[PDB]
């Protein structure tokens, strides 16, 4: 009948609680010596070992709406992008009257407006001033405002352009996480979850797997694939400002090209800088696109339709094509080969699904024959998603480009209405629910080890 | 694209009225809206705009007394009207502008392209 | 971290595992430094709890303070033999502070006046 | 904190207090650092002071040193009666560091040779 | 620092000596900083290792494990007579690991299981 | 100036043209200083 | 500004005490302080 106070130190019992993450790297160095992407990323610990401890007979919840952790992942890639450009050179010089008529190589008619952009130039000994000549894709140029045969930089009188410096060309690293210590990263590890309630099956990790700072529009591209089905994730179906977050379970060959080249020139600044441009466009004209496998596509968005249903357990489902806005919340952006990529989408959501009316099946479509093919154009000057005011240029890329991807998600938002129905469209745009469509497996948690109980001693 | 209006109606001065615009084709949230008034025999006159961004700007003489709402579930926009004056007698219509402002920067302009048929309001003692 | 679902008797045997693991270029930098003192903070706090309490280097103590039936009616048997820690605490936590009020100094402080006292000529 | 303007005795009851307050972007950023690193630096030494005098968790221990009575000739009863350890620690500043050197091994190093000689075969 | 190349038995009369000296503007600023951490760490991590082991005010502690015949053949007399911990440490670098792992919780964990036991009702 | 700069400065000035000024209370300021006079005679605890 | 070739006449007020003769013509003056030392615009949001 004796009970005295005991403490007990080493107690596995832990809390939600907010902290800071930190980065860690593949063994592979970048070899560059530059302080963005080799002194931030291949200067970090490498091989993180994730040796996963299941646990039994645990319950935990996860909210991958609400998380602590997304935040950080917009934070480290806004900094990396700020610090690409600190070292290389600045367009001001540049930005001056430009006489640019349309023409081009052997017989005219594609320009669009690139042709022979002429402009005043004072380099090197600030006296000898310089009329040199150069093509910009005609959507970075602007008609000044005045004569029409005066042009003007897209953004030159409202914000700072800078030139991206050619070691610093950034592409996809697999970035993992680790807590510091009396932190512990626990997943819930479903091959159902949604991303809301209690998870029957969690585990613990010191490191998290690589996930790639891959900007994106509104396809979810060079991701993870779901275990099961298609698994479809919203914060409210019910509400119509909420996106929606398809996640495939099988990927899908896209495949991109800019099929024609580029003779890239230079045009001196100074004491180290250089500002690069299209000089010779050789040889044939092609606009850049994409192709798609129908079949696939299709099988594919009919399940994703078969599911979408469920949120919505009623009537008949429509997609559309983008509505309207920047053409970066109503294309497909991207950056294959250092050189950025719009593709108007429009053509792959243009269609429809009823209730059990007709499954013509036979045609499987056609003999791997029916490739879908869609235009996209290109451009140079970049206000990237993660701030406004300073633009950062893109020096074309001589030659041609190929560039090859997996799709694997889709960010979609919605629209009430019409008949009696549910109306679906690409939506997109903000950069977290790119990375919150992974970052949705994880928690952090603290530990707090000391404990007490009643025992039998004194 | 389509767009359709309801509300207006009677009112005395000082009281409150209330139009609704809602959209076919395309959604109003991701949009350029403008709201305008013409007064009988009269010309245009601007009255609210919303940007895709849905911040408001009104012309002075309505402000603190015209407030303009999105109806997502309704895919609209609501002009509610109150503090009435003779003033705010006419025909009102809402409609939707197609430009392009590239990475913000602007570049094309084509101007307002869909028109709702507009509604009468008429305020009388 | 390996013991949480289990009951406190099973997770009591295994607490050394934690005690191992409790501790131990501008971007992340001034974070890790950050990260690091935090994690000696931590670490010395609770040793500090200790040295207050005694109990200094062992994980399991044992002591001259008697249990509030007030803060739990439940009986021995039935926490240690089918509760985690988790719903424990979350049980505790109110009296959780008078709790460690009262164990730092009735307990060790009232022991070490006496026993120098003892002592004492 | 608040026993200073005490006298000695009266001072010893509380000490525990200090034991709990003694520890825990480019212009205040280094500095919080310097500062926490400090706090640990300074709170370690003195608990290496302990870990060399042994006493180790114990804020009162009493040990096999005999006093000097040419550090100061006062009665017990005098400076435990009426001073501050403000004034005491003016006057036996001098002798601290011999205090410490005599305390640091003649007391607990010899203790540990001898101790394990006692159990040594 | 000055009984490397001493033997065994005479280097291990003087051991404080290093107990003392184990511990204690932005091209040294970060380096400071990292130096002081690490020193930090690394003693921080001996403590704990003592923690788990017992022994932890004590820089010799003897306790109940047995010693290993294969892990060295060695006369004592010849381990303790004519070598320096330079070379000891080189030949049972091997079976270091195997040693803490079981010196971490045979010996002291049973200890606490088995004591808490025996004061147990 | 250019892409992000603009110097601001005085346009048109409006409309009447007073000196900028400050006003006190003449018995406080007078008081007040009577006592500092009366507590300053001790640290020269003299002639006037 | 801005195109750094299409340079324009302007004109501002500031405070008489602000400005210097130039050492030379008294038609011409000066900034107080531009031969000395750089002078920095203070930024709306930092006005402390
Ligand atoms: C995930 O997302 C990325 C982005 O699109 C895709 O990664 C691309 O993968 C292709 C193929 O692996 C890469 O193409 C390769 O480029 C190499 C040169 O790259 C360096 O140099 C250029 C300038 O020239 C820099 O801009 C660039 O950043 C690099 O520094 C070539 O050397 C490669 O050729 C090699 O392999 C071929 C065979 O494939 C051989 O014939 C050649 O001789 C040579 O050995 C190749 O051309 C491309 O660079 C990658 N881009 C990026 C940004 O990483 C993935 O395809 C995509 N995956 C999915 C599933 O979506
Ligand atoms: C809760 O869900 C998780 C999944 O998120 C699940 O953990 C997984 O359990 C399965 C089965 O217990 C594991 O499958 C095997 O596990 C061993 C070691 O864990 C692996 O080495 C195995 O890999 C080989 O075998 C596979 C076929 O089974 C091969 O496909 C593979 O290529 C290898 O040859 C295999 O993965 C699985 O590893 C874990 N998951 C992880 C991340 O380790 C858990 O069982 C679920 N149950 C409960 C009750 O919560
Ligand atoms: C510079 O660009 C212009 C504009 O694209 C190029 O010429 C343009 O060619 C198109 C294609 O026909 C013309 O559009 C249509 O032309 C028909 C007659 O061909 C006309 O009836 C339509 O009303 C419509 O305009 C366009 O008019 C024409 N523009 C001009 C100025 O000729 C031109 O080839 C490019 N290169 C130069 C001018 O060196
Ligand atoms: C992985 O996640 C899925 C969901 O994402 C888990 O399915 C969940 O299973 C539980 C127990 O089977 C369901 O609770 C049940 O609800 C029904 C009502 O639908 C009720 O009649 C039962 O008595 C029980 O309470 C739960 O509803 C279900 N989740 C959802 C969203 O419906 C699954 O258990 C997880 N683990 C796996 C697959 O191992
Ligand atoms: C990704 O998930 C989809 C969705 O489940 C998987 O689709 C599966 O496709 C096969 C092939 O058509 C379906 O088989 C058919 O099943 C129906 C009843 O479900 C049956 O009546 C037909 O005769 C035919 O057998 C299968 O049902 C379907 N899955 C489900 C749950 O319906 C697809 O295989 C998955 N792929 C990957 C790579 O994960
Ligand atoms: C998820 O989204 C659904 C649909 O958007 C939310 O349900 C809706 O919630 C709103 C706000 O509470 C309700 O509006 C209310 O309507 C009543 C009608 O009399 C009105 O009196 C109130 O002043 C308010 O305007 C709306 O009726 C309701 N609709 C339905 C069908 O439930 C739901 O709350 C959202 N869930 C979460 C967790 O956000
Ligand atoms: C699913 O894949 C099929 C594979 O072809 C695609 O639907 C196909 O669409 C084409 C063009 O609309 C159809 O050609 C048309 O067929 C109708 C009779 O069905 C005829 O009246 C028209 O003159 C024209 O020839 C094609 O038949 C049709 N095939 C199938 C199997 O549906 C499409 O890419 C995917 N479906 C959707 C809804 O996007
Ligand atoms: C841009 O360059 C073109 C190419 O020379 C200029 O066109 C010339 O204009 C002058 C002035 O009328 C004519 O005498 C030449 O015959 C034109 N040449 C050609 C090939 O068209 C144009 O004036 C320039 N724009 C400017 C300087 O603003
Ligand atoms: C560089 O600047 C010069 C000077 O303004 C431009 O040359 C002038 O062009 C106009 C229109 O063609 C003529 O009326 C002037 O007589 C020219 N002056 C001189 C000194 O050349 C020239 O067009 C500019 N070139 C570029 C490429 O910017
Ligand atoms: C494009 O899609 C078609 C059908 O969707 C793919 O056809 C596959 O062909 C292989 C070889 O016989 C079969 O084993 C598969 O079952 C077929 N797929 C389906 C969904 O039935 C075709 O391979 C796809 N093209 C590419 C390049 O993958
Ligand atoms: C998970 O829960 C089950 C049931 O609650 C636990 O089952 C115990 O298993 C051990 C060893 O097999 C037995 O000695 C106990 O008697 C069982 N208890 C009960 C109530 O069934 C199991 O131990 C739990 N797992 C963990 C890791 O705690
Ligand atoms: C302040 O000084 C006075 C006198 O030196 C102290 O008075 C003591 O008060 C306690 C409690 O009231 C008595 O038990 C003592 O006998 C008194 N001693 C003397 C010499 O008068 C008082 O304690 C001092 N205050 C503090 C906080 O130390
Ligand atoms: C250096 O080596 C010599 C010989 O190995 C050591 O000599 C010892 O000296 C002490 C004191 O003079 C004697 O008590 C021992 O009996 C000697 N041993 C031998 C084997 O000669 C000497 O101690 C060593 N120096 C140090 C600092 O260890
Ligand atoms: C009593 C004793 O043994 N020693 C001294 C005593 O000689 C002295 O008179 C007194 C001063 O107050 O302090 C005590
Ligand atoms: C240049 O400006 C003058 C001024 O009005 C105008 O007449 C002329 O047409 C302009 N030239 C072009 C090509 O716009
Ligand atoms: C359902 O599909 C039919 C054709 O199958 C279509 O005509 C109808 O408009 C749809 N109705 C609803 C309410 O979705
Ligand atoms: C691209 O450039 C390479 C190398 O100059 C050349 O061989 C190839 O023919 C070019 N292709 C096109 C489409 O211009
Ligand atoms: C360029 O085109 C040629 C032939 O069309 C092709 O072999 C080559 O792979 C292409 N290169 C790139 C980078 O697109
Ligand atoms: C122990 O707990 C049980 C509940 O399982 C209770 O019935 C009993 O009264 C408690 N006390 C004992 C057994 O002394
Ligand atoms: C502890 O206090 C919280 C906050 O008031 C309360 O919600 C909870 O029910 C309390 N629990 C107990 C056991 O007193
Ligand atoms: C002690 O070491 C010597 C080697 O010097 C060896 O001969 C002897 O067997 C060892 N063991 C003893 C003396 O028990
Ligand atoms: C100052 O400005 C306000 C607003 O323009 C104006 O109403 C007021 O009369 C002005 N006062 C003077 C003294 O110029
Ligand atoms: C004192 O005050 C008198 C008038 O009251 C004045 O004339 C005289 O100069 C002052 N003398 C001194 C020494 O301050
Ligand atoms: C400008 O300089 C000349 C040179 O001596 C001088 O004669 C003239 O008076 C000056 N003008 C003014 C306004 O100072």
């Known amino acids: 009948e004796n009970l005295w106070v005991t403490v007990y130190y080493g107690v596995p019992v832990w809390k939600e609680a907010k902290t800071t993450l930190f980065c860690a790297s593949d063994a592979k160095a970048y070899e560059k010596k530059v302080h963005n992407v080799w002194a931030t990323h291949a200067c970090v610990p490498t091989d993180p070992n994730p040796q996963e401890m299941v646990l039994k007979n645990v319950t935990e919840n996860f909210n991958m709406w609400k998380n602590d952790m997304v935040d950080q992942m917009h934070e480290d890639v806004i900094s990396l992008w700020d610090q690409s450009l600190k070292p290389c050179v600045k367009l001001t010089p540049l930005c001056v009257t430009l006489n640019c008529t349309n023409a081009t190589a052997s017989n005219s008619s594609i320009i669009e407006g690139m042709k022979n952009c002429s402009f005043n130039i004072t380099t090197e000994l600030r006296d000898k001033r310089e009329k040199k000549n150069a093509l910009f894709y005609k959507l970075d140029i602007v008609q000044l405002d005045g004569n029409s045969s005066q042009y003007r930089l897209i953004n030159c009188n409202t914000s700072v352009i800078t030139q991206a410096c050619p070691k610093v060309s950034f592409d996809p690293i697999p970035i993992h996480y680790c807590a510091p210590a009396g932190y512990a990263i626990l997943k819930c590890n479903n091959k159902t979850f949604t991303g809301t309630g209690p998870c029957n099956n969690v585990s613990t990790v010191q490191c998290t797997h690589g996930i790639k700072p891959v900007v994106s529009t509104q396809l979810l591209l060079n991701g993870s694939l779901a275990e099961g089905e298609i698994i479809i994730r919203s914060e409210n179906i019910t509400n119509n400002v909420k996106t929606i977050i398809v996640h495939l379970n099988e990927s899908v060959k896209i495949e991109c090209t800019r099929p024609n080249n580029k003779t890239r020139t230079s045009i001196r600044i100074g004491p180290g800088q250089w500002f690069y441009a299209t000089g010779q466009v050789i040889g044939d004209i092609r606009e850049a696109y994409c192709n798609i496998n129908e079949s696939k596509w299709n099988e594919t968005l009919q399940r994703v339709s078969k599911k979408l249903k469920e949120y919505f357990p009623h009537k008949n489902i429509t997609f559309q094509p983008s509505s309207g806005g920047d053409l970066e919340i109503t294309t497909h952006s991207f950056n294959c080969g250092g050189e950025f990529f719009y593709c108007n989408t429009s053509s792959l959501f243009n269609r429809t699904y009823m209730a059990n009316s007709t499954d013509m099946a036979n045609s499987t479509e056609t003999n791997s024959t029916r490739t879908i093919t869609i235009h996209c154009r290109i451009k140079q000057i970049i206000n990237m998603w993660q701030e406004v005011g300073r633009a950062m240029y893109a020096p074309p890329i001589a030659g041609n480009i190929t560039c090859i991807s997996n799709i694997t998600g889709l960010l979609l938002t919605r629209d009430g209405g019409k008949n009696n129905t549910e109306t679906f469209r690409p939506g997109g745009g903000n950069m977290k629910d790119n990375w919150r469509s992974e970052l949705y497996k994880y928690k952090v948690v603290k530990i707090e080890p000391l404990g007490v109980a009643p025992t039998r001693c004194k | 694209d389509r767009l359709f209006q309801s509300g207006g109606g009677v009112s005395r001065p000082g009281g409150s009225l209330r139009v609704n615009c809602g959209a076919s084709g395309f959604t109003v949230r991701t949009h350029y809206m403008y709201w305008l008034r013409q007064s009988p025999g009269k010309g245009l006159e601007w009255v609210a705009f919303?940007?895709?961004?849905?911040?408001?700007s009104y012309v002075d003489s309505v402000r603190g007394r015209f407030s303009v709402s999105r109806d997502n579930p309704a895919n609209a926009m609501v002009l509610q009207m109150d503090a009435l004056k003779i003033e705010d007698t006419g025909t009102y219509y809402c409609?939707?502008?197609?430009?392009?402002?590239?990475?913000?920067?602007?570049?094309?302009?084509?101007?307002?392209?869909?028109w709702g048929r507009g509604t009468i309001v008429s305020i009388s003692s | 971290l390996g013991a949480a679902g289990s009951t406190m008797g099973a997770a009591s045997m295994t607490l050394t595992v934690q005690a191992r693991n409790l501790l131990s270029l501008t971007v992340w930098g001034i974070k890790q430094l950050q990260a690091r003192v935090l994690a000696v903070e931590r670490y010395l706090r609770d040793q500090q709890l200790l040295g207050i309490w005694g109990c200094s280097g062992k994980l399991i103590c044992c002591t001259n303070v008697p249990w509030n039936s007030s803060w739990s009616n439940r009986n021995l048997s039935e926490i240690w033999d089918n509760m985690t820690w988790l719903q424990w605490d979350k049980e505790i936590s109110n009296y959780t502070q008078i709790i460690y009020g009262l164990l730092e100094e009735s307990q060790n402080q009232q022991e070490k006046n006496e026993q120098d006292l003892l002592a004492l000529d | 904190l608040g026993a200073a303007g005490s006298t000695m005795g009266a001072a010893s009851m509380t000490l525990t207090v200090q034991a709990r307050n003694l520890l825990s972007l480019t212009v205040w950023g280094i500095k919080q650092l310097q500062a926490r690193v400090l706090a640990v630096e300074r709170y370690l030494r003195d608990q290496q002071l302990l870990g060399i005098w042994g006493c180790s968790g114990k804020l009162i221990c009493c040990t096999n040193v005999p006093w000097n009575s040419s550090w100061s000739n006062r009665n017990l009863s005098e400076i435990w009666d009426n001073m501050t350890w403000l004034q005491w620690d003016k006057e036996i500043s001098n002798y601290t560091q011999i205090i410490y050197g005599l305390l640091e091994e003649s007391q607990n190093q010899q203790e540990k040779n001898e101790q394990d000689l006692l159990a040594l075969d | 620092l000055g009984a490397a190349g001493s033997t065994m038995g005479a280097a291990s009369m003087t051991l404080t000596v290093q107990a003392r000296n184990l511990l204690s503007l932005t091209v040294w600023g970060i380096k400071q900083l990292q130096a002081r951490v690490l020193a930090v760490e690394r003693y921080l991590r001996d403590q704990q290792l003592l923690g788990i082991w017992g022994c932890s005010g004590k820089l010799i502690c003897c306790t109940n494990v047995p010693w290993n015949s294969s892990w060295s053949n060695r006369n004592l007399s010849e381990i303790w007579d004519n070598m320096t911990w330079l070379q000891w440490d080189k030949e049972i670098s091997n079976y270091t690991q195997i040693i803490y792992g079981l010196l971490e919780e045979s010996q002291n964990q049973q200890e606490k299981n088995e004591q808490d036991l025996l004061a147990l009702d | 100036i250019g892409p992000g700069q603009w110097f601001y400065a005085t346009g048109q000035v409006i409309g009447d043209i007073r000196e900028a000024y400050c006003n006190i209370n003449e018995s406080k300021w007078n008081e007040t200083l009577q006592r500092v006079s009366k507590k300053l005679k001790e640290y020269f605890p003299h002639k006037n | 500004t801005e195109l750094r070739d299409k340079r324009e006449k302007k004109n501002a007020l500031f405070y008489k005490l602000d400005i210097v003769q130039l050492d030379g013509n008294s038609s011409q003056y000066r900034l107080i302080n531009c031969n000395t030392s750089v002078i920095t615009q203070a930024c709306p949001k930092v006005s402390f």
């Open positions: 409609a939707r502008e197609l430009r392009e402002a590239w990475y913000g920067d602007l570049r094309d302009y084509s101007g307002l392209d869909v």
């Open positions: 919303m940007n895709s961004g849905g911040s408001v």
